[PDB]
Design a protein around this ligand. Sequence first.
Ligand SMILES: CC(=O)N[C@@H]1[C@@H](O)[C@@H](O)[C@@H](CO)O[C@H]1O
Length: 506
Amino acid sequence: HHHHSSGLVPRGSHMATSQPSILPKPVSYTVGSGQFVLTKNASIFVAGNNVGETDELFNIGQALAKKLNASTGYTISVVKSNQPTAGSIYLTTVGGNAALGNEGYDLITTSNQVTLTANKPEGVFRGNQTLLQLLPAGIEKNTVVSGVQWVIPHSNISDKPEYEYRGLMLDVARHFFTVDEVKRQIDLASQYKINKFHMHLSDDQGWRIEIKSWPDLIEIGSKGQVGGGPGGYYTQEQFKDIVSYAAERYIEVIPEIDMPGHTNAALASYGELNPDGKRKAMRTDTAVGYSTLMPRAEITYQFVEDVISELAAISPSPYIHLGGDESNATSAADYDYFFGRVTAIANSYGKKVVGWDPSDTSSGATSDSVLQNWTCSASTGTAAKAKGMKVIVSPANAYLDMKYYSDSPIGLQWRGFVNTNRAYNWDPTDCIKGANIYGVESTLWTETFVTQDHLDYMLYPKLLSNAEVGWTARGDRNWDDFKERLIEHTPRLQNKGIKFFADPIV
Ligand SMILES: CC(=O)N[C@@H]1[C@@H](O)[C@@H](O)[C@@H](CO)O[C@H]1O
């Protein structure tokens, strides 16, 4: 047998009775004869195992109706009833197939009815992302589309994720993005079954979360960014609003306050956090590794506790991310000590700790701690594995801030180039052997990204590749297949208003 790898498409990128475009690829998908037609008289019916579950499904139904109404121009409403009428969409958790887990679902479309059967409301929400992809391109428009018959082929889908953790990180410290901009990225990612959003809220160039007991973190530490723009910050109310928005999409928000390194913005806000008692100058360059909290000063741990206390109060995720990357101004002994102490503080506030490697090596880590493995070397996470810690993988292939190509107008290249193909052609088991792999996280660092258009360009289509790696089983993943599916999907990216890169490899 003969095999080959993909080159660039001759003559440029392709991204430059019915055809559904399901991404990530579902466990199974078959189509039969006939079609369902969505008309102006359609209702969404919802039915759970009890009234409280029905009420939760009702909210999900209303979210679905909102999306359908925006493009069809209909006014589809939601009904609490297990007696759907011909032409209805029916969302139910009664009789879910338990083997599909919390996020799985069956989605069966007949001529008369669309029925989505799940174990839990979360699974109905994920299934709804598939439903939107079975309708014609045009359905994902934010304004009314005319001349398109709203049909769904008679079809049968069963589905469930391979990995529990499928995440996106946005760096809002290097360049600030508004609550609206962040909500938009959360919303877009949710449509591809991303279920975790990690916010990198502080770094050397900015501090982005209001801490009432240390007001100058905002008054001074939020006032810049990379390149000397004005920066910005989230009030605690705005952070809660982001969390609530994500919650409606069954997305967990994990806030990160990076320590002991990547801390210049804090050090520039409060002089007492520095050995000489003087505030650092703010930094607007892109250097890393130079900053450190004082590992042996009690003021450091009072500061960390106040931050953790306020953040824990407003962040319902059982996890807090305490960073731990590139502490090059911190000795190994001090790092080990520091990270163990802050893990004890977090645990006292009822939060488990996520940290970048090498944080798993801290003797104060517990088996409830989580390692975010970005280095992905042979020895990374040796400690985590020995300790029974869950591992989230973020290899070069998930570093979505990497240039697509040598000539990309934005992005970094310290992990080489990451085009859509590279973002696809890997498996979490490649990154670490012998570990409890919790899942994948796509990291969008923002040293070189200033506008929403820059975010869009780097995340799309790259994130789509990463999202399939998290959801779809390795045995069902194939670049030649995904590539062709991605071409088919392109008009939907257009319709959503995403300023994607038309990758020449697609
Ligand atoms: C864990 C991690 O990625 N740390 C830093 C991050 O702050 C950013 O600079 C990024 C750019 O790709 O790479 C690393 O230098």
